[PDB]
Amino acid sequence: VIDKLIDLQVNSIISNDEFRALEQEWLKVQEVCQEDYDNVEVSILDVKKEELQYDFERNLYDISSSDFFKKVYVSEFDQYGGEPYGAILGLYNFENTTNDIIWLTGMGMVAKNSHAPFIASIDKSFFGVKDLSEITHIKSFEALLEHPRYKEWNDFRNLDVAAYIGLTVGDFMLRQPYNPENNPVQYKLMEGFNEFVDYDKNESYLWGPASIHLVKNMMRSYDKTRWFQYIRGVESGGYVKNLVACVYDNKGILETKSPLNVLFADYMELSLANIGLIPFVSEKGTSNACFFSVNSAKKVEEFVDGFDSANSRLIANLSYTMCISRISHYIKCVIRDKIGSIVDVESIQKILSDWISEFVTTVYQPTPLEMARYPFRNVSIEVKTIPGKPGWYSCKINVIPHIQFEGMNTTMTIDTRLEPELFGTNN
Amino acid sequence: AKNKIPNSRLMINYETNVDGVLKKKELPYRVLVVGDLSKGRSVDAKKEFADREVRRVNNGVDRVLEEMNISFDFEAPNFVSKDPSNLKVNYRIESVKDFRPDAVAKKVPEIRALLEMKEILASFAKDIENNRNL
Amino acid sequence: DRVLEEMNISFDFEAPNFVSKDPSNLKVNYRIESVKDFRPDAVAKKVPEIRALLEMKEILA
C-alpha cells in the first residue's frame, strides 16, 4: 500500500507546472546533442524570450548595439581568434502577434549579418486554431494569408532578413508517459518502483518543436557530406528515423499514437511551403517523418519574366542560403590571413575561385549522398578594384545551386497513333 | 653570439632555418541554441545579459547541466511524513535523468522515507521462515 | 516608437467608470511610449483601475 502513496506523491510533482517546464526545456536540448559528430560543436545560451523581446524591441533601429548581436557577430564571428556560429536554433514558438513579429525581425537582422540561418517553430495560435491537429481542416493556407488578419505578417515576409528565418510546423513527442507495461520507470536495485503509472489521455503530455530535428539534420548534413543539400526529401536528407511514439490500452488492444502532432497530407506539404513554413510531415504508422519543404519565410513572388520568377524561387529556399552563407564564413575568415599581403584583382579571383572550384560540377554522381558533396552548379567571381582606395576591392559572386526536385504533373493517354502499323489504314 | 666567431679557411655552417606560412585548423560548425532553460535559475542566467558566457557542451548535456546550478524550491501537495507544511521539492539537477519519476524519490527527502521502508519492510523473509521443513 | 517616447505625450481625459469603488469617473492618465499603446491591452496594463480586474484574472482564473 506504500506503492499507493508514491503513485500519488511523485505523480503530484511530475504533473506540476514549472517542474515539467524544465523537462520540456531540457529533453529537447538532449535531443539535439544526441548524435555527437566529428566536427560539430553545439553550444547553449539560456535566455528568457522576454529578455530578448526587450532587447530587439529597444534596438530594432540600432541593431549593432543589441546585446545579443554583441554575442554572436562582434564577439566570435567578427573577432580574429573567435569561432563563428552557424544556424541558430530558436527553441521558442512564435505567434502572429505584432510583438513576436519583431522578435524575428531582430533575430533575422542578426542572422542576416552574422550569416547564421535562424530556425524556429510557430505556435498553433498562428492559424487561429486552438488545436494544431485541426489545421488539417483548412483547405489551402494560400487563401488563408489573404485574410487581413495576416497583414502585419505579409509585410515581414517581404523583408530581406526573412530569407534567413525558417519556421517549422508540427511538434514531435519527446517523452512517452509512464506506464508499467509501457515505458516503465527504471526503479532501483531493491526499491520497487517499476509499478508506477501516470495520468494522460487525449493530447497533453509533453511536446517539442520540429525545429530540433531540422537542425539536428543540418548537423548530420555536415559530418557526412559537407554542405546543406542533405536536409530535404526522403531518399536525400530529412528522414528522421526512429521517433518516440506512444501506445495505450484504453479498452481495445494497445492503440498506437502517432509520434507527430499532426498528420499532414500531401497537398499540406506543399500548401505550407508557399506560406514560408517548414512542415514536419509524418508517415502514418511508420513512426517516422521527413522534411519535404525547407523554405524560408521569404515571399516567393511570381513575376512575368521567367528568370526573375526562378530567382525568387531559389532565394526563398532555405537550404541554399545555408550554403551561400558558408561562403561568407570562408571569405570573412580565411582571406583575413592575407590582409597585408600584396595581391591583385587577378590574385583574389584565384584564391577565392581555386577553393570553391572543388564544389562545383555538372555531372551527377550515383546515389544522393555521393553527389550532395557538390552543392553548386557553377559560379562567377568578378572582383575589381575601386578608385580612391588603393588597397581596397569589391567582389561580386553569383552561385547557381543544384536545383532540387519539387514536383511534377503528368498526363497519361491512350494515343493509338504511336504505332500506326496496327491501327493505320494501309494493311 | 652576435659578435660572430672568427672565420677560418673552411667555414661550414649548416642552415636549419625554414620559412613558410603556418597552417590553420578547421572550424567546427558551431550551432547556437537559444531557449529558456533555467527559467531564471542558473549561475550564468542570474547574471545580466551584457555578460553571459555561452556554454559549449564539450562533454554532454549531463555535465554541462550540472555545471549550472539549476535548483528549484516549488511547493507541492504532501502525502508523506507528519506535521503540516506542504512538501517542498528542493534539489539541484545533475543529469538529464533527474526528471525520471525515480531519481525524484531518491532526491526529495520526504518521499525517500517511504522508499526506505520498501527496502526493509518488503525484504521480510516470510518465505525463508515460512519454508520451515522440519 | 522612440521618437514618440521622446515627446511627453500624456492625456488626462475622463471616461465612464466600471471598476473599483467610490465615485469619480475613471481618469485615464499615462504617457505614450510606443505606438502599440493604443492597443486595447496595453491600455489595461497602464490604467491603474482596470489593472485591478486584470490582476484577479491572474490569480482567480
Side-chain angles (χ1 to χ4, degrees), chain A residues 3 9 13 16 18 25-26 30 39 41-47 51 71 85-89 91 178 186 191 193 333, chain B residues 27 29-34 36-38 41 44 52 54-56 58 70 74 76-77 96 101-102 104 111 115 118-119:
Chain A
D3 311 37
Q9 217 317 299
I13 53 176
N16 189 340
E18 184 181 342
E25 296 291 348
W26 275 105
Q30 181 180 5
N39 41 12
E41 184 179 355
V42 302
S43 54
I44 310 301
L45 179 49
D46 48 337
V47 185
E51 293 179 9
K71 294 178 58 51
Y85 293 95
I88 304 168
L89 198 175
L91 295 170
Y178 301 94
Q186 288 76 345
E191 301 180 2
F193 217 102
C333 174
Chain B
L27 286 174
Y29 178 68
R30 291 177 60 74
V31 176
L32 184 67
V33 302
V34 184
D36 50 333
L37 312 196
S38 310
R41 281 107 71 177
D44 63 328
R52 291 198 194 187
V54 296
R55 321 305 295 191
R56 287 298 199 89
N58 299 322
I70 299 173
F74 75 105
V96 191
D102 168 72
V104 176
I111 305 169
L115 277 289
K118 292 287 265 61
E119 290 185 342

Short mmCIF file of all heavy atoms in Angstrom, two decimals, chain A residues 3 9 13 16 18 25-26 30 39 41-47 51 71 85-89 91 178 186 191 193 333, chain B residues 27 29-34 36-38 41 44 52 54-56 58 70 74 76-77 96 101-102 104 111 115 118-119:
data_model
loop_
_atom_site.label_atom_id
_atom_site.label_comp_id
_atom_site.label_asym_id
_atom_site.label_seq_id
_atom_site.Cartn_x
_atom_site.Cartn_y
_atom_site.Cartn_z
N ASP A 3 3.00 1.70 -2.16
CA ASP A 3 3.04 2.00 -3.59
C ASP A 3 1.92 2.98 -3.95
O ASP A 3 2.08 3.80 -4.85
CB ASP A 3 2.89 0.71 -4.42
CG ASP A 3 3.84 -0.38 -3.96
OD1 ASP A 3 4.07 -0.50 -2.74
OD2 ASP A 3 4.34 -1.13 -4.83
N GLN A 9 2.27 10.58 -4.69
CA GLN A 9 3.22 11.58 -4.24
C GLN A 9 4.03 12.13 -5.41
O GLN A 9 4.00 13.33 -5.70
CB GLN A 9 4.16 11.00 -3.18
CG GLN A 9 4.52 11.98 -2.08
CD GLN A 9 4.84 13.36 -2.62
OE1 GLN A 9 5.77 13.54 -3.40
NE2 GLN A 9 4.04 14.35 -2.21
N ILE A 13 4.07 15.97 -8.57
CA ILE A 13 5.08 16.96 -8.96
C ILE A 13 5.54 16.78 -10.41
O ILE A 13 6.04 17.72 -11.02
CB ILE A 13 6.32 16.90 -8.03
CG1 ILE A 13 6.88 15.48 -7.95
CG2 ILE A 13 5.96 17.41 -6.65
CD1 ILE A 13 8.15 15.37 -7.15
N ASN A 16 2.97 18.60 -12.08
CA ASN A 16 3.02 20.00 -11.69
C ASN A 16 3.66 20.85 -12.78
O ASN A 16 4.57 20.41 -13.48
CB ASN A 16 3.81 20.16 -10.38
CG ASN A 16 3.72 21.56 -9.79
OD1 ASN A 16 3.40 22.52 -10.49
ND2 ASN A 16 4.01 21.68 -8.50
N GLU A 18 5.88 24.26 -14.00
CA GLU A 18 7.23 24.67 -13.62
C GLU A 18 8.21 23.49 -13.65
O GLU A 18 9.27 23.58 -14.27
CB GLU A 18 7.23 25.32 -12.23
CG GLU A 18 8.59 25.85 -11.81
CD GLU A 18 8.58 26.46 -10.42
OE1 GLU A 18 7.48 26.79 -9.92
OE2 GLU A 18 9.66 26.61 -9.83
N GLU A 25 12.11 21.88 -21.62
CA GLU A 25 13.21 22.75 -21.99
C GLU A 25 14.58 22.11 -21.74
O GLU A 25 15.59 22.80 -21.64
CB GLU A 25 13.10 24.07 -21.22
CG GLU A 25 11.86 24.89 -21.57
CD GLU A 25 11.91 25.46 -22.97
OE1 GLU A 25 12.99 25.43 -23.60
OE2 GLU A 25 10.86 25.95 -23.44
N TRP A 26 14.61 20.78 -21.63
CA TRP A 26 15.88 20.04 -21.50
C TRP A 26 15.85 18.75 -22.30
O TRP A 26 16.87 18.31 -22.80
CB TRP A 26 16.19 19.73 -20.03
CG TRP A 26 16.90 20.87 -19.35
CD1 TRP A 26 16.37 21.74 -18.44
CD2 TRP A 26 18.27 21.26 -19.53
NE1 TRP A 26 17.32 22.65 -18.04
CE2 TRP A 26 18.49 22.38 -18.70
CE3 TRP A 26 19.32 20.78 -20.32
CZ2 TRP A 26 19.73 23.02 -18.63
CZ3 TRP A 26 20.54 21.42 -20.25
CH2 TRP A 26 20.73 22.53 -19.41
N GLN A 30 18.52 17.72 -25.06
CA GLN A 30 19.21 16.45 -25.15
C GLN A 30 19.05 15.87 -26.55
O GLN A 30 19.92 15.16 -27.05
CB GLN A 30 18.68 15.46 -24.11
CG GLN A 30 19.38 14.12 -24.13
CD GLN A 30 18.84 13.16 -23.10
OE1 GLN A 30 17.87 13.46 -22.41
NE2 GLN A 30 19.47 11.99 -22.99
N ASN A 39 32.99 16.95 -36.06
CA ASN A 39 33.36 18.36 -36.07
C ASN A 39 32.13 19.27 -36.10
O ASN A 39 31.96 20.08 -37.01
CB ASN A 39 34.27 18.65 -37.27
CG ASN A 39 33.83 17.93 -38.52
OD1 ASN A 39 32.73 17.39 -38.58
ND2 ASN A 39 34.69 17.91 -39.53
N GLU A 41 30.46 21.25 -33.00
CA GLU A 41 30.36 21.59 -31.60
C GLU A 41 29.19 22.53 -31.35
O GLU A 41 29.25 23.71 -31.70
CB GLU A 41 31.66 22.23 -31.12
CG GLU A 41 31.70 22.53 -29.63
CD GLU A 41 33.01 23.15 -29.20
OE1 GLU A 41 33.92 23.26 -30.05
OE2 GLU A 41 33.14 23.53 -28.02
N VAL A 42 28.13 22.02 -30.74
CA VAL A 42 26.99 22.85 -30.38
C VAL A 42 27.35 23.78 -29.23
O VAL A 42 28.50 23.84 -28.81
CB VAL A 42 25.78 22.00 -29.97
CG1 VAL A 42 25.39 21.06 -31.10
CG2 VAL A 42 26.08 21.24 -28.69
N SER A 43 26.36 24.50 -28.72
CA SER A 43 26.58 25.47 -27.66
C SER A 43 25.25 26.06 -27.20
O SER A 43 24.32 26.18 -27.99
CB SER A 43 27.51 26.59 -28.14
OG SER A 43 27.02 27.18 -29.33
N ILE A 44 25.20 26.44 -25.93
CA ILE A 44 23.95 26.84 -25.30
C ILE A 44 23.95 28.33 -24.97
O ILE A 44 25.00 28.97 -24.98
CB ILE A 44 23.71 26.03 -24.01
CG1 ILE A 44 23.87 24.54 -24.29
CG2 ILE A 44 22.32 26.30 -23.43
CD1 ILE A 44 22.93 23.99 -25.35
N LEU A 45 22.77 28.86 -24.71
CA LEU A 45 22.63 30.22 -24.21
C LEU A 45 21.24 30.41 -23.61
O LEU A 45 20.33 30.91 -24.27
CB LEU A 45 22.86 31.23 -25.34
CG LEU A 45 22.71 32.70 -24.94
CD1 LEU A 45 23.51 32.99 -23.67
CD2 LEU A 45 23.15 33.61 -26.08
N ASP A 46 21.07 29.99 -22.35
CA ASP A 46 19.75 30.01 -21.72
C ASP A 46 19.26 31.43 -21.47
O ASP A 46 19.78 32.12 -20.59
CB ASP A 46 19.76 29.22 -20.39
CG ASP A 46 20.92 29.60 -19.50
OD1 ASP A 46 21.94 30.10 -20.02
OD2 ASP A 46 20.82 29.39 -18.27
N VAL A 47 18.27 31.86 -22.24
CA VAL A 47 17.70 33.19 -22.09
C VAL A 47 16.20 33.17 -22.26
O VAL A 47 15.67 32.52 -23.16
CB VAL A 47 18.30 34.18 -23.12
CG1 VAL A 47 17.77 35.60 -22.86
CG2 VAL A 47 19.82 34.16 -23.07
N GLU A 51 13.66 38.56 -22.28
CA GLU A 51 14.95 39.24 -22.16
C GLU A 51 15.53 39.57 -23.53
O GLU A 51 16.47 40.34 -23.65
CB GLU A 51 15.94 38.38 -21.36
CG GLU A 51 15.56 38.20 -19.90
CD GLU A 51 16.54 37.33 -19.15
OE1 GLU A 51 17.60 37.00 -19.72
OE2 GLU A 51 16.25 36.95 -17.99
N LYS A 71 27.10 39.18 -29.09
CA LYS A 71 27.46 37.88 -28.53
C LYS A 71 27.34 36.81 -29.60
O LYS A 71 27.09 35.64 -29.29
CB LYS A 71 26.57 37.53 -27.33
CG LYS A 71 26.77 38.45 -26.13
CD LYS A 71 25.83 38.09 -24.99
CE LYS A 71 26.02 36.65 -24.53
NZ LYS A 71 27.45 36.32 -24.26
N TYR A 85 29.51 31.35 -35.29
CA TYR A 85 28.37 30.48 -35.13
C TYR A 85 27.80 30.11 -36.49
O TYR A 85 28.17 30.70 -37.50
CB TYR A 85 27.30 31.14 -34.27
CG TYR A 85 27.73 31.33 -32.84
CD1 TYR A 85 28.29 32.53 -32.42
CD2 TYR A 85 27.59 30.31 -31.92
CE1 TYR A 85 28.69 32.70 -31.11
CE2 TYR A 85 27.99 30.47 -30.61
CZ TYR A 85 28.53 31.67 -30.21
OH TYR A 85 28.93 31.83 -28.91
N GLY A 86 26.90 29.14 -36.51
CA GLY A 86 26.27 28.69 -37.74
C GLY A 86 24.90 28.11 -37.45
O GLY A 86 24.77 27.15 -36.70
N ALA A 87 23.88 28.72 -38.04
CA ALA A 87 22.50 28.27 -37.88
C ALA A 87 22.07 28.25 -36.41
O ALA A 87 22.17 27.23 -35.73
CB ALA A 87 22.31 26.89 -38.49
N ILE A 88 21.57 29.39 -35.94
CA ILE A 88 20.98 29.49 -34.61
C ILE A 88 19.70 28.66 -34.56
O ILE A 88 19.10 28.36 -35.60
CB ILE A 88 20.68 30.96 -34.25
CG1 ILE A 88 21.96 31.80 -34.36
CG2 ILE A 88 20.09 31.08 -32.84
CD1 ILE A 88 21.74 33.30 -34.30
N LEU A 89 19.29 28.26 -33.36
CA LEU A 89 18.09 27.46 -33.17
C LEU A 89 17.19 28.07 -32.10
O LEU A 89 17.47 27.96 -30.91
CB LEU A 89 18.46 26.03 -32.80
CG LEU A 89 17.39 24.95 -32.97
CD1 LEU A 89 18.00 23.59 -32.65
CD2 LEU A 89 16.16 25.19 -32.10
N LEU A 91 14.32 27.92 -29.77
CA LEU A 91 13.52 26.89 -29.14
C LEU A 91 12.12 27.39 -28.79
O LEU A 91 11.33 26.67 -28.18
CB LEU A 91 14.23 26.38 -27.88
CG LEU A 91 15.56 25.67 -28.11
CD1 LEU A 91 16.28 25.43 -26.79
CD2 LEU A 91 15.35 24.35 -28.84
N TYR A 178 4.45 7.55 -18.46
CA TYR A 178 4.93 6.40 -17.69
C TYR A 178 3.85 5.37 -17.37
O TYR A 178 2.93 5.64 -16.60
CB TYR A 178 5.56 6.89 -16.40
CG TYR A 178 6.72 7.82 -16.65
CD1 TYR A 178 6.54 9.20 -16.68
CD2 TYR A 178 7.99 7.33 -16.89
CE1 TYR A 178 7.60 10.05 -16.93
CE2 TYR A 178 9.06 8.17 -17.14
CZ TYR A 178 8.86 9.53 -17.16
OH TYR A 178 9.92 10.38 -17.40
N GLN A 186 12.69 3.12 -14.56
CA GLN A 186 13.78 2.27 -14.13
C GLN A 186 13.99 2.43 -12.64
O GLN A 186 14.66 3.36 -12.19
CB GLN A 186 15.05 2.59 -14.92
CG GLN A 186 15.01 2.14 -16.38
CD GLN A 186 14.17 3.05 -17.26
OE1 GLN A 186 13.38 3.86 -16.77
NE2 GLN A 186 14.34 2.92 -18.57
N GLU A 191 14.37 -0.93 -4.24
CA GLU A 191 13.18 -0.10 -4.09
C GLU A 191 12.22 -0.29 -5.26
O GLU A 191 12.36 0.35 -6.30
CB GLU A 191 13.57 1.38 -3.97
CG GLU A 191 14.50 1.68 -2.80
CD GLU A 191 14.87 3.15 -2.71
OE1 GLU A 191 14.38 3.94 -3.54
OE2 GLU A 191 15.65 3.51 -1.80
N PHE A 193 9.74 0.18 -7.78
CA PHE A 193 9.19 1.42 -8.30
C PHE A 193 8.61 1.26 -9.70
O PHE A 193 7.80 2.07 -10.13
CB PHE A 193 10.26 2.51 -8.32
CG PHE A 193 9.75 3.87 -7.96
CD1 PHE A 193 9.97 4.40 -6.71
CD2 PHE A 193 9.03 4.62 -8.88
CE1 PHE A 193 9.50 5.65 -6.37
CE2 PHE A 193 8.55 5.87 -8.55
CZ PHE A 193 8.79 6.39 -7.29
N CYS A 333 37.04 35.09 -42.88
CA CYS A 333 37.55 34.03 -42.02
C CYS A 333 38.94 33.62 -42.46
O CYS A 333 39.87 33.53 -41.66
CB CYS A 333 36.62 32.81 -42.04
SG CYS A 333 37.25 31.38 -41.13
N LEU B 27 37.43 24.76 -38.75
CA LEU B 27 36.46 25.34 -37.83
C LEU B 27 35.29 24.39 -37.60
O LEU B 27 34.57 24.04 -38.54
CB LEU B 27 35.94 26.67 -38.37
CG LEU B 27 36.90 27.86 -38.28
CD1 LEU B 27 36.28 29.06 -38.98
CD2 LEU B 27 37.23 28.21 -36.83
N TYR B 29 31.72 23.39 -37.08
CA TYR B 29 30.46 24.05 -37.39
C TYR B 29 29.64 24.23 -36.12
O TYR B 29 28.92 23.33 -35.70
CB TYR B 29 29.68 23.24 -38.42
CG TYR B 29 28.33 23.81 -38.77
CD1 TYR B 29 28.22 25.00 -39.47
CD2 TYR B 29 27.17 23.14 -38.43
CE1 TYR B 29 26.99 25.52 -39.81
CE2 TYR B 29 25.92 23.65 -38.77
CZ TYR B 29 25.84 24.84 -39.45
OH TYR B 29 24.61 25.35 -39.79
N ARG B 30 29.75 25.41 -35.52
CA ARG B 30 29.07 25.68 -34.26
C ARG B 30 27.57 25.88 -34.45
O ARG B 30 27.14 26.46 -35.44
CB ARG B 30 29.68 26.91 -33.58
CG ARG B 30 31.09 26.69 -33.08
CD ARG B 30 31.67 27.95 -32.48
NE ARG B 30 30.87 28.43 -31.36
CZ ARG B 30 30.86 27.85 -30.16
NH1 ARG B 30 31.59 26.77 -29.93
NH2 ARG B 30 30.10 28.35 -29.19
N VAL B 31 26.80 25.40 -33.49
CA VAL B 31 25.35 25.55 -33.50
C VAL B 31 24.89 26.18 -32.20
O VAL B 31 24.95 25.55 -31.14
CB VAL B 31 24.63 24.21 -33.69
CG1 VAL B 31 23.11 24.40 -33.60
CG2 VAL B 31 25.02 23.60 -35.03
N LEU B 32 24.43 27.42 -32.29
CA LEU B 32 23.89 28.11 -31.14
C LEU B 32 22.42 27.75 -30.96
O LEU B 32 21.68 27.68 -31.94
CB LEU B 32 24.06 29.62 -31.31
CG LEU B 32 23.62 30.48 -30.12
CD1 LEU B 32 24.54 30.23 -28.93
CD2 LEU B 32 23.59 31.95 -30.52
N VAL B 33 22.01 27.49 -29.73
CA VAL B 33 20.60 27.32 -29.42
C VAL B 33 20.21 28.31 -28.33
O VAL B 33 20.97 28.55 -27.40
CB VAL B 33 20.26 25.88 -28.96
CG1 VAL B 33 20.65 24.88 -30.04
CG2 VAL B 33 20.93 25.55 -27.63
N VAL B 34 19.02 28.89 -28.46
CA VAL B 34 18.56 29.90 -27.52
C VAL B 34 17.15 29.56 -27.07
O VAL B 34 16.20 29.60 -27.86
CB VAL B 34 18.60 31.31 -28.15
CG1 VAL B 34 18.21 32.36 -27.13
CG2 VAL B 34 19.98 31.60 -28.73
N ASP B 36 14.64 29.38 -23.07
CA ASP B 36 14.55 29.49 -21.62
C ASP B 36 14.76 28.13 -20.96
O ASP B 36 13.83 27.33 -20.85
CB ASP B 36 13.20 30.09 -21.21
CG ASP B 36 12.03 29.39 -21.87
OD1 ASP B 36 12.21 28.84 -22.97
OD2 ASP B 36 10.93 29.40 -21.29
N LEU B 37 15.99 27.87 -20.53
CA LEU B 37 16.34 26.59 -19.92
C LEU B 37 16.17 26.64 -18.42
O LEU B 37 15.50 25.80 -17.82
CB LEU B 37 17.78 26.21 -20.26
CG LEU B 37 18.20 26.33 -21.72
CD1 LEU B 37 19.49 25.56 -21.94
CD2 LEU B 37 17.10 25.84 -22.67
N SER B 38 16.80 27.64 -17.81
CA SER B 38 16.88 27.74 -16.37
C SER B 38 15.65 28.41 -15.76
O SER B 38 15.43 28.34 -14.55
CB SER B 38 18.14 28.52 -15.98
OG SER B 38 19.27 27.99 -16.64
N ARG B 41 17.12 30.46 -13.24
CA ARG B 41 17.79 29.78 -12.14
C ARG B 41 19.08 29.10 -12.59
O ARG B 41 19.13 27.89 -12.78
CB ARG B 41 16.87 28.75 -11.50
CG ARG B 41 15.86 29.35 -10.54
CD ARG B 41 14.48 29.34 -11.13
NE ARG B 41 13.94 27.98 -11.20
CZ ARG B 41 12.71 27.68 -11.61
NH1 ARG B 41 11.88 28.64 -12.00
NH2 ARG B 41 12.32 26.42 -11.63
N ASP B 44 24.87 31.55 -14.82
CA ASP B 44 25.01 32.43 -15.98
C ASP B 44 23.67 33.06 -16.36
O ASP B 44 23.63 34.02 -17.14
CB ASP B 44 25.59 31.66 -17.16
CG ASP B 44 24.68 30.54 -17.64
OD1 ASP B 44 23.97 29.96 -16.79
OD2 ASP B 44 24.68 30.25 -18.85
N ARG B 52 26.87 37.13 -20.33
CA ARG B 52 26.50 35.72 -20.22
C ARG B 52 27.39 34.86 -21.10
O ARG B 52 27.17 34.74 -22.31
CB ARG B 52 25.04 35.49 -20.60
CG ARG B 52 24.06 36.05 -19.62
CD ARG B 52 22.69 35.43 -19.83
NE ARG B 52 21.64 36.17 -19.13
CZ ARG B 52 20.38 35.76 -19.04
NH1 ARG B 52 20.01 34.62 -19.60
NH2 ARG B 52 19.49 36.50 -18.39
N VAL B 54 28.49 32.03 -23.06
CA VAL B 54 27.84 30.90 -23.70
C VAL B 54 28.52 29.59 -23.31
O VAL B 54 29.74 29.54 -23.14
CB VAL B 54 27.85 31.04 -25.23
CG1 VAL B 54 27.03 32.25 -25.66
CG2 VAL B 54 29.29 31.13 -25.75
N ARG B 55 27.73 28.53 -23.16
CA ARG B 55 28.26 27.21 -22.83
C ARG B 55 28.83 26.55 -24.08
O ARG B 55 28.94 27.19 -25.12
CB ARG B 55 27.18 26.33 -22.21
CG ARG B 55 26.24 27.07 -21.26
CD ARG B 55 26.99 27.80 -20.15
NE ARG B 55 27.68 26.87 -19.26
CZ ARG B 55 28.23 27.22 -18.10
NH1 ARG B 55 28.16 28.48 -17.68
NH2 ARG B 55 28.84 26.31 -17.36
N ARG B 56 29.17 25.27 -23.98
CA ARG B 56 29.80 24.56 -25.08
C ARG B 56 29.28 23.15 -25.25
O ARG B 56 29.16 22.65 -26.37
CB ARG B 56 31.32 24.52 -24.88
CG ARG B 56 32.01 25.85 -25.12
CD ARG B 56 31.84 26.30 -26.56
NE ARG B 56 32.83 27.30 -26.94
CZ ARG B 56 34.02 27.02 -27.44
NH1 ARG B 56 34.40 25.77 -27.63
NH2 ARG B 56 34.85 28.01 -27.75
N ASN B 58 30.92 20.51 -24.28
CA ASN B 58 32.08 19.70 -24.68
C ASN B 58 31.85 18.25 -24.30
O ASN B 58 31.95 17.35 -25.13
CB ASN B 58 33.35 20.22 -24.02
CG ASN B 58 33.68 21.64 -24.41
OD1 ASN B 58 33.49 22.04 -25.56
ND2 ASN B 58 34.18 22.42 -23.46
N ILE B 70 21.12 24.62 -11.38
CA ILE B 70 19.68 24.60 -11.61
C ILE B 70 18.98 23.88 -10.47
O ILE B 70 18.89 22.65 -10.46
CB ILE B 70 19.31 23.92 -12.95
CG1 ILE B 70 19.94 24.68 -14.12
CG2 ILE B 70 17.78 23.86 -13.13
CD1 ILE B 70 19.79 24.00 -15.47
N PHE B 74 9.92 24.81 -5.40
CA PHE B 74 8.48 24.95 -5.63
C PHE B 74 7.70 24.02 -4.72
O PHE B 74 8.15 22.92 -4.39
CB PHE B 74 8.15 24.66 -7.10
CG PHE B 74 8.18 23.21 -7.47
CD1 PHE B 74 6.99 22.51 -7.66
CD2 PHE B 74 9.38 22.54 -7.62
CE1 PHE B 74 7.01 21.17 -7.99
CE2 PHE B 74 9.40 21.20 -7.96
CZ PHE B 74 8.22 20.51 -8.14
N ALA B 76 4.45 21.64 -3.31
CA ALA B 76 3.68 20.54 -3.87
C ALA B 76 2.84 19.85 -2.79
O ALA B 76 3.21 19.88 -1.62
CB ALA B 76 4.60 19.54 -4.55
N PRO B 77 1.71 19.24 -3.19
CA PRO B 77 0.85 18.54 -2.23
C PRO B 77 1.60 17.47 -1.43
O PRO B 77 2.39 16.72 -2.00
CB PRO B 77 -0.22 17.90 -3.12
CG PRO B 77 -0.25 18.75 -4.33
CD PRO B 77 1.16 19.20 -4.55
N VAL B 96 20.30 14.64 -16.86
CA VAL B 96 19.01 14.86 -17.51
C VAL B 96 18.00 13.80 -17.08
O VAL B 96 16.80 13.95 -17.30
CB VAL B 96 19.14 14.84 -19.05
CG1 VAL B 96 17.86 15.35 -19.71
CG2 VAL B 96 20.34 15.67 -19.51
N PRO B 101 10.69 9.88 -12.95
CA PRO B 101 9.96 9.54 -11.72
C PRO B 101 10.59 8.37 -10.98
O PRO B 101 10.08 7.25 -10.98
CB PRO B 101 8.55 9.20 -12.23
CG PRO B 101 8.43 9.92 -13.52
CD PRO B 101 9.80 9.87 -14.13
N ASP B 102 11.73 8.64 -10.35
CA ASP B 102 12.52 7.62 -9.67
C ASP B 102 13.69 8.31 -9.00
O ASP B 102 13.90 8.18 -7.79
CB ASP B 102 13.02 6.56 -10.66
CG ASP B 102 14.06 5.65 -10.04
OD1 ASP B 102 13.71 4.81 -9.19
OD2 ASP B 102 15.25 5.77 -10.43
N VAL B 104 13.64 11.24 -8.59
CA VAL B 104 12.93 12.22 -7.79
C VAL B 104 12.74 11.69 -6.37
O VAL B 104 13.02 12.39 -5.39
CB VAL B 104 11.57 12.55 -8.41
CG1 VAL B 104 10.78 13.50 -7.53
CG2 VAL B 104 11.75 13.14 -9.81
N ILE B 111 9.90 11.84 0.47
CA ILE B 111 9.47 10.65 -0.26
C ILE B 111 10.40 9.48 0.04
O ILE B 111 9.97 8.33 0.10
CB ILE B 111 9.45 10.88 -1.79
CG1 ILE B 111 8.59 12.09 -2.14
CG2 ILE B 111 8.93 9.64 -2.51
CD1 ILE B 111 8.73 12.54 -3.57
N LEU B 115 10.37 5.06 0.60
CA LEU B 115 11.23 4.18 -0.18
C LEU B 115 12.19 3.43 0.72
O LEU B 115 12.64 2.33 0.40
CB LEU B 115 11.99 4.99 -1.23
CG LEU B 115 11.24 5.30 -2.53
CD1 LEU B 115 11.08 4.04 -3.35
CD2 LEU B 115 9.87 5.93 -2.26
N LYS B 118 10.45 0.33 2.00
CA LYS B 118 10.30 -0.68 0.95
C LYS B 118 11.58 -1.50 0.78
O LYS B 118 11.57 -2.55 0.14
CB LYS B 118 9.94 -0.01 -0.37
CG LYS B 118 8.55 0.61 -0.38
CD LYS B 118 7.46 -0.46 -0.44
CE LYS B 118 7.01 -0.72 -1.87
NZ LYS B 118 8.11 -1.23 -2.74
N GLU B 119 12.67 -1.02 1.36
CA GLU B 119 13.92 -1.77 1.35
C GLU B 119 13.95 -2.74 2.52
O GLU B 119 14.45 -3.86 2.40
CB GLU B 119 15.12 -0.82 1.43
CG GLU B 119 15.33 0.00 0.17
CD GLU B 119 16.59 0.84 0.24
OE1 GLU B 119 17.11 1.05 1.36
OE2 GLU B 119 17.06 1.29 -0.83
#
